[PDB]
Design a protein around this ligand. Sequence first.
Ligand SMILES: [Mg+2]
Ligand SMILES: [Mg+2]
Ligand SMILES: [Mg+2]
Ligand SMILES: [Mg+2]
Ligand SMILES: [Mg+2]
Ligand SMILES: [Mg+2]
Ligand SMILES: [Mg+2]
Ligand SMILES: [Mg+2]
Ligand SMILES: [Mg+2]
Ligand SMILES: [Mg+2]
Ligand SMILES: [Mg+2]
Ligand SMILES: [Mg+2]
Ligand SMILES: [Mg+2]
Ligand SMILES: [Mg+2]
Ligand SMILES: [Mg+2]
Ligand SMILES: [Mg+2]
Ligand SMILES: [Mg+2]
Ligand SMILES: [Mg+2]
Ligand SMILES: [Mg+2]
Ligand SMILES: [Mg+2]
Ligand SMILES: [Mg+2]
Ligand SMILES: [Mg+2]
Ligand SMILES: [Mg+2]
Ligand SMILES: [Mg+2]
Ligand SMILES: [Mg+2]
Ligand SMILES: [Mg+2]
Ligand SMILES: [Mg+2]
Ligand SMILES: [Mg+2]
Ligand SMILES: [Mg+2]
Ligand SMILES: [Mg+2]
Ligand SMILES: [Mg+2]
Ligand SMILES: [Mg+2]
Ligand SMILES: [Mg+2]
Ligand SMILES: [Mg+2]
Ligand SMILES: [Mg+2]
Ligand SMILES: [Mg+2]
Ligand SMILES: [Mg+2]
Ligand SMILES: [Mg+2]
Ligand SMILES: [Mg+2]
Lengths: 199, 150, 125
Amino acid sequence: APSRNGMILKPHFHKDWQRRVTTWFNQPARKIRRRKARQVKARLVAPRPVSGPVRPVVRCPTNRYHTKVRAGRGFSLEELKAAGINKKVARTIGISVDPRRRNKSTEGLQTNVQRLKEYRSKLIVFPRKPSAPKKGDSTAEELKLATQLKGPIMPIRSVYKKEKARVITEEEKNFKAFASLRMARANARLFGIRAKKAK
Amino acid sequence: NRQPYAVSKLAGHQTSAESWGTGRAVARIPRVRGGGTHRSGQGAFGNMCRGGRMFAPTKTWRRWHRRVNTTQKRYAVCSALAASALPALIMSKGHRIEEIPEVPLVVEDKVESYKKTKEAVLLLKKLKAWNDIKKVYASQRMRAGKGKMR
Amino acid sequence: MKFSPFVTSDRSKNRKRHFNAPSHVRRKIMSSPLSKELRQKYSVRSMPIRKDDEVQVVRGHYKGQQIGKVVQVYRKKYVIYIERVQREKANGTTVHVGIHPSKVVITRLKLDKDRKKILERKAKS
RNA sequence: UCAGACCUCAGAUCAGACGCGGCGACCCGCUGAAUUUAAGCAUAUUACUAAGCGGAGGAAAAGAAACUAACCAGGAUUCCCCCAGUAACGGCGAGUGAAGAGGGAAGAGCCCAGCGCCGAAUCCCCGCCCGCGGGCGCGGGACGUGUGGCGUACGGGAGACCGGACCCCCCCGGCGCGCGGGGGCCCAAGUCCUUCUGAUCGAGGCCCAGCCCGCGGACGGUGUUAGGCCGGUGGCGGCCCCCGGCGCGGCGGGACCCGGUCUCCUCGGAGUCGGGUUGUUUGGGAAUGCAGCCCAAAGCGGGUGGUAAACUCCAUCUAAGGCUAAAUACCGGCACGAGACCGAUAGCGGACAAGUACCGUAAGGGAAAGUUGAAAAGAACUUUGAAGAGAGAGUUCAAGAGGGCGUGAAACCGUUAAGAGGUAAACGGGUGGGGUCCGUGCGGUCCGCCCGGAGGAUUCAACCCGGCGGGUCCGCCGGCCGGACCGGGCCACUCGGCGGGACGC
RNA sequence: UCUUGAAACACGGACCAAGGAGUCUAACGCGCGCGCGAGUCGGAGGGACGCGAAACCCUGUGGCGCAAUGAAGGUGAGGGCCGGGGCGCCCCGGCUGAGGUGGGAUCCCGCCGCGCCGGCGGGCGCACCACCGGCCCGUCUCGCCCGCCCCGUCGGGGAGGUGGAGCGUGAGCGCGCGCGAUAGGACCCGAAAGAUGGUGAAC
RNA sequence: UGGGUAUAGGGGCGAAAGACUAAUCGAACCAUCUAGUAGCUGGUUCCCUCCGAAGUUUCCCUCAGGAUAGCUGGCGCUCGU
RNA sequence: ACGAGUAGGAGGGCCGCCGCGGUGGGCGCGGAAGCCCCGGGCGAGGGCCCGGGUGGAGCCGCCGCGGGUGCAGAUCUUGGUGGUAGUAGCAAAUAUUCAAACGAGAACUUUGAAGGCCGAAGUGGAGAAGGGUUCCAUGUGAACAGCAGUUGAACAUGGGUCAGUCGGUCCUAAGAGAUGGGCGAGCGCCGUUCGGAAGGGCGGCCGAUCGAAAGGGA
RNA sequence: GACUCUUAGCGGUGGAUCACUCGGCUCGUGCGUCGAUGAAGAACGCAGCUAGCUGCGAGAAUUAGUGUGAAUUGCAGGACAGAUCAUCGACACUUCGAACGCACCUUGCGGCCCCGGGCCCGGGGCCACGCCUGUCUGAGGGUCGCU
Ligand SMILES: [Mg+2]
Ligand SMILES: [Mg+2]
Ligand SMILES: [Mg+2]
Ligand SMILES: [Mg+2]
Ligand SMILES: [Mg+2]
Ligand SMILES: [Mg+2]
Ligand SMILES: [Mg+2]
Ligand SMILES: [Mg+2]
Ligand SMILES: [Mg+2]
Ligand SMILES: [Mg+2]
Ligand SMILES: [Mg+2]
Ligand SMILES: [Mg+2]
Ligand SMILES: [Mg+2]
Ligand SMILES: [Mg+2]
Ligand SMILES: [Mg+2]
Ligand SMILES: [Mg+2]
Ligand SMILES: [Mg+2]
Ligand SMILES: [Mg+2]
Ligand SMILES: [Mg+2]
Ligand SMILES: [Mg+2]
Ligand SMILES: [Mg+2]
Ligand SMILES: [Mg+2]
Ligand SMILES: [Mg+2]
Ligand SMILES: [Mg+2]
Ligand SMILES: [Mg+2]
Ligand SMILES: [Mg+2]
Ligand SMILES: [Mg+2]
Ligand SMILES: [Mg+2]
Ligand SMILES: [Mg+2]
Ligand SMILES: [Mg+2]
Ligand SMILES: [Mg+2]
Ligand SMILES: [Mg+2]
Ligand SMILES: [Mg+2]
Ligand SMILES: [Mg+2]
Ligand SMILES: [Mg+2]
Ligand SMILES: [Mg+2]
Ligand SMILES: [Mg+2]
Ligand SMILES: [Mg+2]
Ligand SMILES: [Mg+2]
């Protein structure tokens, strides 16, 4: 079966694969079906945005992605508490709530609190009964300039701010970057073996 | 833009035909089980047999669609547009432009608000492009082949 | 062109729906154009064929100017019989020759309560 | 207990309901192979497949963390992309093989038991009475061996204080008032002229705009090949009868006080986790899941932290209770649209009285078979024969279409015509003969240019003249247009990990 | 047709008609064509909006390349010229950006014989190849310097051999075509068997 | 000897022949797994131009077969000429 | 200058087939495709063009594009037809003959006569299982009845099976099979007494039901 | 010249080829609905002339309702003046079958209630099993009470 120089291949076709083969001949019709479903959903919630509630800014877990951010599931109960929003009233005005998410730092906590205070500034709350507004209801002059928002509410963008150019000091020139990394690995590797000698 | 075509999976195989083996002066082909039917004793599976399975039945998962690079798809348009500006290539294509005002035939935007066919027909008569429409009428014929049944 | 996804352009579907059309549908299919005097009087171009209607054959072997009254509307055969459009068999007995309704023009309409109601609807639109 | 109650367990053709079978493409729970690959073969693979059994729904299932991760943290489930033919598994051979993260589709979250507060505050049934729901019963029951309200880990409750509610909102019925379907009836224009044809739908024509319509030149029918003959097609087209929604108002009947602080108080699921062992399963490897048996928990507990174990730190979740739409699947069914597909030995076995005829005791097996003509006009009548079957006649464009009838090949056969024939017949090469055809001897068998001569006929030629046209891709002009082009002004300009720079208008 | 050998007393073939056998999907390799090029590709999805299930536009998450090497902890690819200094065998400054030897299409120059054409005299030498340095990772031998807030079982560098699918001023990526070896019914037809379920004591 | 019953496929039944179990028995029949596999036979469809073999080496539970080297063809390319 | 070629490789094809995008103001009832041809040709070949005949409605060239694209073989598949061949054969169970009738037609039918066979464990007369209208009458002579047929168990059209006392029905025989119970992942299986099993008139029964057209049975 | 061989015309056998296509296959889309109120499947029967197919259920080749508006048609007929067709909200819908009184290789064998006719005949409604709630009738020192 083998021949002159080649690659040892691994064809995973030793089962009855032809019995289970999914073709994508309905992919164009699926694109129209989802597009049509979004148009029907938009008419259902006519003033409300078609995307849905507001998603918070979250930091991706792993080292491969902990530099960028994305849209999470919902705002933490601590962020709702800091922004002065009740956990149950938030879902009525289109705010996603995630009772599971934690806040280990104040950088991510204040990131969404600002995002959550900014969304409530753009809210146009219609009255429960149009013939009698209430305290939380917006004024009739503001209800006229109320259109359905298309796309995600407050798209999460990460605009990179430039580090200001500065004259290099002698302390930065004398800093040994390679020596500080090799010694950091040794001090973190020999930390336990030195802690026993101290006893 | 073409639709997938394929032969049924059960074609030529929805029969319990067993080869008679050797020693019967037959051709060792799977033959239909006995009975009071003229089908009994006939080949049923091979591609050479009448009513059998075709060789390599066409599968629906054939790679019908080809993907082209966006840079090449735009390249071909820039070349087809550049070719629509030469009088030799338009005439060699067969269009009747021997009397049009200019080879790149740009008209005013007033023609984008037309709403009747007689307005469009009159525009083609003024631009001397109606001779190409009459050439389409002279080419209206019937296809040669099984396309007429499809 | 045809843009409705509810209408078919398939030759087999349109031929099957024609040869297997019900009787009340074959009536609409077996229509015939009105004469110049009738198309201007009622403002109707064509009407479904009727038994007591008088027609003129415009195409075929029996075409001419002789106004003949229809004697039978054979929807099962997609053909009508006219009073003078006929031929003699071998045994001398005469037999009517079938003429398609789209090949005859209506010169006189059998006007009853139902015929005038259709002429009013077709002319209203 | 006026002496019987309760518990447990029976009977009924008791009153009123429910279950059963089919389908099973997709889906859920079990069960379970071997061909095959390893060039043998035993683990492995085939395959956690087929066959077998059970259970549903238009989807199912799963699903709101006893999770991932080790980060600057993520945050129910399902599906797609990627991770990745990678980590890992494997006679470490053949082969097998995921997940976290990341990008998308879709996004919706919730309810108990326990705990302790509330006079069981809860529910069914019968009868009656009102408009499938409601009241009424001094009606019958269920229930304290625990119904309902509050309340569920995101904590919760109570009491105070504070700020806001309080015929509003919310829910269910149907009325006022305007938008997705179902079924009907309609909705533009040549049978104009000439001609061919058995039949036009052919061919040509139809003053200046090329006959008319065109938001209609899809398709089909019509005796040929039709936008305009007909049905249709086109049209944010008309009309009529229904159906199902949504929005805005009022009417009727039902729900019904929410937040913020402090204090005080309260807080969870057991023959289950887990350990051992066995079998099976998995990429999961000192055990990924599942199950049998034994052992058998704890409550600063318990589970997880991909190598067994002890000590310790840390992170994360809160198992042993339940519900929940969307994105997703669909070879069955129902109804549609389509085809670079097949075109009657093909495509489904089945274009037809096809799962039919027929076969087998049965389980099952399972065909062959489409075409007269435009219209039956399907051959009257005469004549031979007992009759099939013929001869005339007749229909038709055609019987050279005469009822398994369009076209009618080959093998094979009859017959005619030609030639030939004792080394089977056929075959290559070469020529001869014959035959059938083709092209030729028509006033034979030669053209073109120019020139010489003759004969007759000219919108008669060179040259000149006035205007026109084209070429010089010939010299002066003048515009226009493009920029890795130069210097000045101006822009909703734009632009970049710099008001200036650059870009272009 | 198999065969060393077929007119064979070797096999198939009475005759004619139609049907009848190298396919498709995945993945790999090379060659070729195309696009862009240290990039390259939307192959999920999204958005413009009869044929239109097309085409158009956006999205680079990600894949494949741009870095290799070690089992791993890990570490990780600049040569040359000039001057000064050290004289062992490697310090400093400057100018530059891949060295040296042999060969080398092409280009350049001189001279001669006729601003062209032949003689031999040199030069800058592409790609590539032979060879010699140099550098990165693994490993080994011999070693005397150096660094620090986390001075230690610490972390760094040298010299000389050697292992590597390296570096040494990228060449890949996407798409299509063809062929080749594969796994799939796999060019077509063929087993003796094996398995699951079921039907028969009318013989 | 009829009829009615009983035993069903690795089973039945057998005064025993591997007999018989629906013309089928040293393991019935039916459908499926299944287009099971085959280093083994058979066949494998148009023309032309150009080039053109090997039955040998090594290894193989190989010796009717593969892997490998050789022989072949294609594609070129670096130069000379 | 050169020219062999199997296996094999490669290239060229204005060789051929089906379908698609283009294109030829292509072709066609004044006759397309197909088919036939002792018709004229062309190309080295694959093949192609033209003419005639037949046919009756579609078809083709060129540039690209997609293949279920080219047959003499496979004891190929399906269908059709030959030589064999007017050949094998129409030879088991003794046997027919004469006259007449009907009829186009008689070795075969019918009637009569003669001669024979079965010889009462029949070639006789009636049933069971099985068959299912084959039964009967009339008519047909086309296909079938392996010659013929005026005949038929063929074909066509009508008709025909009458029950208290014949059998089924009733009883259980070997058996089979529910209920309780047990098992089993499950469809289900095991099981025929084994459980509050009496639906009647003080009750015993012990096992529902099915199972004989040859048993029992007015 | 019989026979034989080749070629051609014509005629046979045969069915290719071509043209035709109310069929298939594939893809896509929307629905995605069975049954004790008797399902799927099966049996039998139903038309003036009717075998198969198809459609129906003793109201049987269809009834009513509604839409449509003159046919159906092989032939006869007068039914037929709202013909015909479509649609389908009314009504009807034999037997077997989960199949349900017990059985079924039987149109076998019963029981209860009611009605009509003369215990018999006919008609109508009922009688499977499992199980839920309730009712009624019970059972046992099983646990108590009262005697
Ligand atoms: Mg090889
Ligand atoms: Mg099969
Ligand atoms: Mg087939
Ligand atoms: Mg053709
Ligand atoms: Mg069921
Ligand atoms: Mg093996
Ligand atoms: Mg093998
Ligand atoms: Mg299965
Ligand atoms: Mg759904
Ligand atoms: Mg669910
Ligand atoms: Mg596996
Ligand atoms: Mg038309
Ligand atoms: Mg019209
Ligand atoms: Mg396993
Ligand atoms: Mg489907
Ligand atoms: Mg077929
Ligand atoms: Mg010999
Ligand atoms: Mg052999
Ligand atoms: Mg032979
Ligand atoms: Mg062929
Ligand atoms: Mg060099
Ligand atoms: Mg290779
Ligand atoms: Mg085995
Ligand atoms: Mg017996
Ligand atoms: Mg078995
Ligand atoms: Mg023996
Ligand atoms: Mg050669
Ligand atoms: Mg050799
Ligand atoms: Mg051999
Ligand atoms: Mg094809
Ligand atoms: Mg083929
Ligand atoms: Mg052949
Ligand atoms: Mg008789
Ligand atoms: Mg008779
Ligand atoms: Mg005979
Ligand atoms: Mg008969
Ligand atoms: Mg009995
Ligand atoms: Mg008896
Ligand atoms: Mg012939």
